[PDB]
Amino acid sequence: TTAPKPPSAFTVEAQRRVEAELPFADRADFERADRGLIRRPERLLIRNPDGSVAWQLGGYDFLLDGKPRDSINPSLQRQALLNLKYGLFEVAEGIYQVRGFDLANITFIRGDSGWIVVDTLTTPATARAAYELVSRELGERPIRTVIYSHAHADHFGGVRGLVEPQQVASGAVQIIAPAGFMEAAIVLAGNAMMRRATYQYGTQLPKGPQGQVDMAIGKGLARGPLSLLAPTRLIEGEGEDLVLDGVPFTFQNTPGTESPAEMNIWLPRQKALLMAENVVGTLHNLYTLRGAEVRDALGWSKYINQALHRFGRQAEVMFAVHNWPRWGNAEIVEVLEKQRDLYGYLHDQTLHLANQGVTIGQVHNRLRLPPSLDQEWYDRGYHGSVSHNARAVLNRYLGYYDGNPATLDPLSPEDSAGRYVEYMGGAERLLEQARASYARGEYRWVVEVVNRLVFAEPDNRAARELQADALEQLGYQAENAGWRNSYLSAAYELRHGVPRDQGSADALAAMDTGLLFDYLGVRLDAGAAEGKALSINLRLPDIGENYLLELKNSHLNNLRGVQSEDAGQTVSIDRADLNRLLLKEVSAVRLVFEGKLKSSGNPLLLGQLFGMLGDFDFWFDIVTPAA
Amino acid sequence: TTAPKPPSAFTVEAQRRVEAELPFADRADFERADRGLIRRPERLLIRNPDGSVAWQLGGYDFLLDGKPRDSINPSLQRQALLNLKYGLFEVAEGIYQVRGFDLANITFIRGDSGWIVVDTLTTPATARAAYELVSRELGERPIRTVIYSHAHADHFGGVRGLVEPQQVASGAVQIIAPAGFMEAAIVLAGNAMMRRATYQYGTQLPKGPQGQVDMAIGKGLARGPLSLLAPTRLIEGEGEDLVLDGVPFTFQNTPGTESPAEMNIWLPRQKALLMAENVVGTLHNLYTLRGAEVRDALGWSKYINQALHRFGRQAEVMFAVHNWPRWGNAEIVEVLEKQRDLYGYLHDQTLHLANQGVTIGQVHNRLRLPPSLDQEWYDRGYHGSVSHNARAVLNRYLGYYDGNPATLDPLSPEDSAGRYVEYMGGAERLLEQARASYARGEYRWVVEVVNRLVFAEPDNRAARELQADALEQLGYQAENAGWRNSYLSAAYELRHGVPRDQGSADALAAMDTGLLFDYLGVRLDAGAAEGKALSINLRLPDIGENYLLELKNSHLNNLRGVQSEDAGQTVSIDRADLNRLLLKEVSAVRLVFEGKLKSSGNPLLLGQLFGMLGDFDFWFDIVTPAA
Ligand SMILES: CCCCCCCCCCS(=O)(=O)O
Ligand SMILES: CCCCCCCCCCS(=O)(=O)O
Ligand SMILES: [Zn+2]
Ligand SMILES: [Zn+2]
Ligand SMILES: [Zn+2]
Ligand SMILES: [Zn+2]
């Protein structure tokens, strides 16, 4: 059978254990998440210009009765309900947030003549909807300044919902960002990350008790066009004190924590501390499972300590770009200390263990937070997990290899699987044993062993169905939203298979030219490039950049600021026009006839290079070997 | 039986295949490695001041007959003999190198009044011995300048063998380094890295056909005290043109390639290009298996391209801090192009594959260099490997997790092993099957499956002996020196068990104070720190630094430039005296009585904190679960 199964007796027991272990009696977050509520719109339904739906919350109604469901980890269910506390809120005098209109929050700070806005959600429609709610309740005011707290799409993505380029061009609107913002906002492993993200975000799952229920730092991500307008002003060095529209702001740069470009904000008049995405209502990711570079827990901890000693000590309210605020100086001091020691403990104790010989394959089964950190709701592994972050720290310092040469040169899973199956007496015998293990509630073992059979025999329905059943129990048990979604998406694909039916101008415009060509080098089909050699001078006059492109030894090189008198072709095109070509907004033929694409030398080389560029299928297999 | 076994028939066949696949007819390296030889001392034996032996080459005599040995990959054997071409060499007019006195080379450049020296080997005794050979053959000359090509111990370690602090202090000797040198020269995962390095370096193996034979970039690493004298001058930005003792030097910074602080050197008078450790006689590591952060192949490739377009185009000789030079402009241009496209192809094609859904557990079995790159001796995987570097690139962008939730929350190997064994019919049945697989030459499979049995039953001699036999065949087959050494060290420990019998003042002095306390936080025993809280102001007047130390929530924090009026204790000590304490060169009691260690507040806190500090056993288990 191919439909979700009820929670097993072992899964039920695991949920009861969560309740026994975690401080459910501490319900203060429920008060915090409702404090200062101005308006919760009755229903929320946000639409995109093309008619698609950007965001809606009606799919979460099953959570509203607040009744426990054993197919959901009760800690995650608690977070799931708190994230449904959406609408317009007062944080402090003249500081408001619209929460639950998208994954992130959007913050409106009262200036003398308009709003200073912090962040802009993921897509213009959600941002626009938030601004409309603000105007209905507080009165319409022009937005004078938009500040990006950091370089992530759930924060800069909806900017065109608030302001337009002509406002920025005229100086009516300023955009403030931490130094390094443009370099960090925008690729090379994009298809792999996006496809792996369908698991983490559970994009194929229904919203419900046996599907997606929450995304930890918010309900989920709004769907729509991605916008991005470049900053007009950057916060340099350690930070800067600015006055915006009569309001004093202190910006504290925290480079290389949750994002390479990030800054906390202190508002001294309100004694309000906006902790960007450094401190949120959950342990955050040191490693995002969809795939990204490992983050620096050591710096993350130190920057939280820096904020504590500078501001925390005088703060009356602390708030963030995800989740809800926390009021009271003693509460804020403790949250800052604990979040600082959370990242610090994860870092320090992973390394303490590693230095004792505990490997990347063992550390998550050994490392446990001490009670003082374990027993706070904002330290729970909803977004990041202690388990995956400990392995992340270890991977950052020691790498993927566990040091045991048995594992140094491993056969691909699909190549060793047939032998595992044979050694275990064949598929039927393996299933018999795995089913007995399943009946004992040993899901973490079952998913490892039955995965071998699925890889040996991807058309073995019985194997896929058992693997799916065990993964699903693990998803029900998961406190982590990303783990849950991944387990349930894996079950879904094992049961149903992968779909057989299957661009942002601003994002492309933000991409450095060198990175664009690095990406084109990634698209290069090695088979097509084999034995070829060509050099092309590329000139981009609007941005005043020159690149030397060299294809040789089945590799595309690009080099900024150099030209070769020996290149076989010289090509001139504005970066703006190159952008349009890639976005299919203009044809190369029309550009050549307009005199916008120019060439000397052999007119064919760039075309020949383009013809070697391959493509990537989005729906590649994950839970089985490639079809 | 517990002694090395002969190469199997499959291993022999694998060696013959290497010969069929690789260009052994290309023997030009043999001429290159002998070119400009001035003196090869008859025997080489270098001793340390305490009487220990730093370096000797007599253990490699078995290689001298040049006869093929099937327990050594013939490509590695070729490299092993070329690395035995040691002694004093002329590279170009007034440019000499002493090769094979240590892992790295040391370079002497004739100035008007003395030597400009590039790098200093690993330990003073080897450096001193190299200088003595130089003086015997070319005449004794003062060393006026020492340049560190980059921030690695096999390059700055022997500096005290050449110069002393009073020479630097008086300005008689200058030390030049790339900007960032001191930050990159010096920890947190040190015990784990060092212990894992016993495998990579094969520190327990004899020198011989069934032991250690070479270390790729050199024969091995000299053993002795580690020295380091701080630079007096840093090469800033992209680089700088300097004149040293009448000789013109162009320094090209290449930050974040083989080392975070590295610079190539162009010598325009001799048209000589010293490629630091960017281009050597082998594919280098993107990931060193002993464990370290993943290196940036993209930047590595671009920096090689930058050197090519700036200098390569006019170079007559190219040489490096490891291995031998290559003469002739056409040869140099090709080597630079190929090394550039080597790192570029590894990067680009790993990502091309990953974007198609190929995982970190599959990529090394899919990625292959094109013939133009595969068929050059300096592109062979002696130091780095295509296999481990491809997985490294993938790990850098996507992380350790393959995206399949079967693998998201894995049981530790020792906890799932008992079940693998049971499912496979028990130990005897598993061995029976594994022995048949062994008889078919399926070593990569045998080491994966028998490893399960060793982990289930670490005292099962029969299992350990088979695992050892299979690993050993893999070590014999390995072209990579680190892989070979690791496979043979694993066999050694399985057969014999781990030893049951078991500081650099300069290195400690080079360590930032914050990093020192970060390291102390890593030593913190969480059990001992539980429930404790303390704050200590630490003042270090000689360096003018203040730190706030806070222990809370089982985590030690240190914060530069802040002090707390609420700290329970204030401690004052020069960093120089703190160094001496840690090195056991002075007792804390003697320092307090000398007035060199001062305290206000509760005199006990720092002592209490120190008492919570744990230690790490060096010889932790790798190939079995912890004893
Ligand atoms: C349209 C893309 C939206 C991107 C929103 C996700 C934020 C990226 C950072 C990953 S993490 O969630 O901080 O761990
Ligand atoms: C006494 C320690 C000697 C360190 C020498 C090894 C160099 C460190 C860098 C690793 S790698 O060999 O570049 O990949
Ligand atoms: Zn973010
Ligand atoms: Zn965010
Ligand atoms: Zn090095
Ligand atoms: Zn080196």
UniProtKB/Swiss-Prot annotation, chains A, B:
Q: Which InterPro entries match?
A: Alkyl/aryl-sulf_dimr_sf (IPR038536), Alkyl_sulf_C (IPR029229), Alkyl_sulf_dimr (IPR029228), Bact_Alkyl/Aryl-Sulfatase (IPR052195), Bds1/SdsA1_MBL-fold (IPR044097), Metallo-B-lactamas (IPR001279), RibonucZ/Hydroxyglut_hydro (IPR036866), SCP2_sterol-bd_dom_sf (IPR036527)
The record ties this protein, via SMART domains, to: Lactamase_B
- UniProt KW Acetylation keyword: no
Phenotype of gene-disrupted mutants? Insertion mutant cannot grow with SDS as a sole carbon and/or sulfur source. Disruption of the gene leads to a decrease in the growth in mucin minimal medium and a reduction in the degradation of both carbohydrate and protein moieties in mucin. Mutant shows reduced swimming, swarming and twitching motilities and decreased mucin gel penetration ability. Virulence of the mutant is attenuated in leukopenic mice compared with the wild-type strain.
What does the record note about the induction of this protein?
Up-regulated in mucin minimal medium.
The record's GO molecular-function terms, alphabetically, read:
identical protein binding; linear primary-alkylsulfatase activity; metal ion binding; protein dimerization activity
Sorted alphabetically, which keywords does the UniProt record give?
A: Hydrolase, Metal-binding, Periplasm, Signal, Virulence, Zinc
Please give the function described in this protein's UniProt entry.
Alkylsulfatase that cleaves both short and medium-length alkylsulfates, including the widely used detergent sodium dodecyl sulfate (SDS). Acts in vitro on primary alkylsulfates such as decyl sulfate, octyl sulfate and hexyl sulfate, but not on sulfated sugars and arylsulfates. The hydrolysis of SDS allows the bacterium to use SDS as a sole carbon or sulfur source. In addition, contributes to the in vivo virulence of P.aeruginosa by playing a central role in the degradation of mucin, a glycoprotein that is the primary component of the mucus overlaying the host epithelial tissues.
> How does this protein assemble?
Homodimer.
This protein is called Linear primary-alkylsulfatase
